[PDB]
């Protein structure tokens, strides 16, 4: 039979059968209970709208993501999300399909063990396998080397790989991602008068960020230009009218990636953690990693980031090496495409964690040889 390539993610759940080009169903991972009282009788009001249904009734819900930073903080809601994904968005019972979840690097063990225990006890799948979210993104590019920066919505991690041999001592995981950029944008919009507070209006700020923000090639020059002319002010229409005008908030929101001091984080930007991740590698594979830098994940879709990052790394790196940044147009679904490719391989067909194996060793089987 065919395998189910699910990809929990944090912000958008992407799923679909193995062997295709794009995920079949992509929908936000939010579960929102209603918060008001409700007076109409017999309206058929449910107790929790999940997935894309709660992005249409969000006016009277309190949306809450069940995955904070890669890790899962609310297991009941995550189980509800998985149940919805299997039964309503794909309509395939899990009793007859292997599953291939994905997990960020350096995550707590208990999260992974609970994930496998749920998949084997509640949904009762035949066999499931957990894979690191960066190796798949490297599969999708058709490479076999390269250092991949997978800046998702929950957590940004940077896994270097050479000739198929991952370097476990050079993984640099940073917890700045799309959600923190949404919060920072929502916080700097208040400098013009627009106040978004409700958890429903966070979605509106996210839409503003997606449609308007861009990464500046040079930060100081843009700050000077936006403060003199008015060629940058782009307007946007809220879900009820009252258009708003975003000035130099456009390139200040995604600039947080390269200067995490804006949101008070100490660490260095995504332009310098990649160079540090390279320098921890051996001295003889640094040229190949320099030449095959891969971008993935949703948050790396800002217009103009593949040039800013290249300029920064070229500034840091030695002058002789060639710096090349691979930015495929299908960046958002790169991890899932790689997952489909991996699940479609014949050599991989014996790596699944078969159910009888789980019955013999318990949920701690995932840390064992079947990784």
């Amino acid at each position: 039979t065919t395998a189910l390539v699910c990809d929990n993610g944090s912000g958008l759940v992407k799923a679909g059968f193995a062997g295709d080009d794009a995920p079949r169903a992509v929908f936000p991972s939010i579960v929102g209970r209603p918060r008001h009282q409700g007076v109409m009788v017999g309206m058929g009001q449910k107790d929790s709208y999940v997935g894309d249904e709660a992005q249409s009734k969000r006016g009277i819900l309190t949306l809450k993501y069940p995955i904070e930073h890669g890790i899962i903080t609310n297991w009941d809601d995550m189980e509800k999300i998985w149940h919805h994904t299997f039964y309503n968005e794909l309509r395939v019972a899990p009793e007859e399909h292997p599953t291939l979840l994905t997990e960020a690097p350096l995550n707590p063990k208990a999260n992974r063990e609970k994930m496998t225990q749920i998949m084997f006890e509640t949904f009762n799948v035949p066999a499931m396998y957990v894979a690191i979210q960066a190796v798949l993104s490297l599969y999708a590019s058709g490479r076999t080397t390269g250092i991949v920066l997978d800046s998702g919505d929950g957590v940004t991690h940077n896994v270097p790989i050479y000739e198929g041999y991952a370097l476990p001592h050079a993984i640099m995981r940073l917890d700045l991602a799309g959600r923190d950029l949404t919060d920072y944008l929502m916080k700097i919009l208040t400098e013009r008068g627009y106040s978004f507070v409700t958890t429903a209006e966070r979605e509106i700020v996210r839409d503003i960020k997606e449609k308007l923000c861009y990464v500046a090639l040079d930060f100081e020059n843009e700050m000077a230009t936006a403060a003199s002319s008015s060629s940058l002010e782009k307007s946007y229409e809220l879900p009820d009218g009252q258009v708003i005008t975003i000035g130099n908030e456009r390139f200040r929101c995604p600039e947080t990636l390269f200067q995490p001091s804006f949101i008070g984080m100490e660490s260095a930007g995504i332009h310098e953690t990649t160079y540090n991740s390279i320098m921890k590698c051996d001295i003889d594979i640094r040229k190949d990693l320099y030449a095959n830098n891969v971008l993935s994940g949703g948050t790396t879709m800002y217009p103009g980031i593949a040039d800013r990052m290249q300029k920064e790394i070229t500034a840091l790196a030695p002058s002789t090496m060639k710096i090349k940044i691979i930015a495929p147009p299908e960046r958002k679904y790169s991890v899932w495409i790689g997952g489909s490719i991996l699940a479609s391989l014949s050599t991989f067909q014996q790596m699944w964690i078969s159910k009888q194996e789980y019955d013999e060793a318990g949920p701690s089987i995932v840390h064992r040889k079947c990784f």
Binding site: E53, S56, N88, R91, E121, T122, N124
Partner: protein, 74 residues
């Protein structure tokens, strides 16, 4: 639950259903008739479970149709 409770129910079902296996103690006629009748019973069970597969497939298709209907509401 949902993994040993159902296991326990099916185990008890097998225990009460699988009667005593003891053959060479009696005349061939009674045991032959018992074996033939139980084979016919399990044949009827095969027919019933096949019809259950057909009907459950039809109701799954109806569930898909009603999912399409509830999707038509938006």
């Amino acid at each position: 639950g949902k993994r040993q409770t159902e296991r326990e129910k099916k185990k008890k079902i097998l225990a009460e259903r699988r009667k005593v296996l003891a053959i060479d103690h009696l005349n061939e006629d009674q045991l032959r008739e018992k074996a033939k009748e139980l084979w016919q019973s399990i044949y009827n069970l095969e027919a019933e479970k096949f019809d259950l597969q057909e009907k459950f497939k039809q109701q799954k298709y109806e569930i898909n149709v009603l999912r399409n209907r509830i999707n038509d509401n938006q």
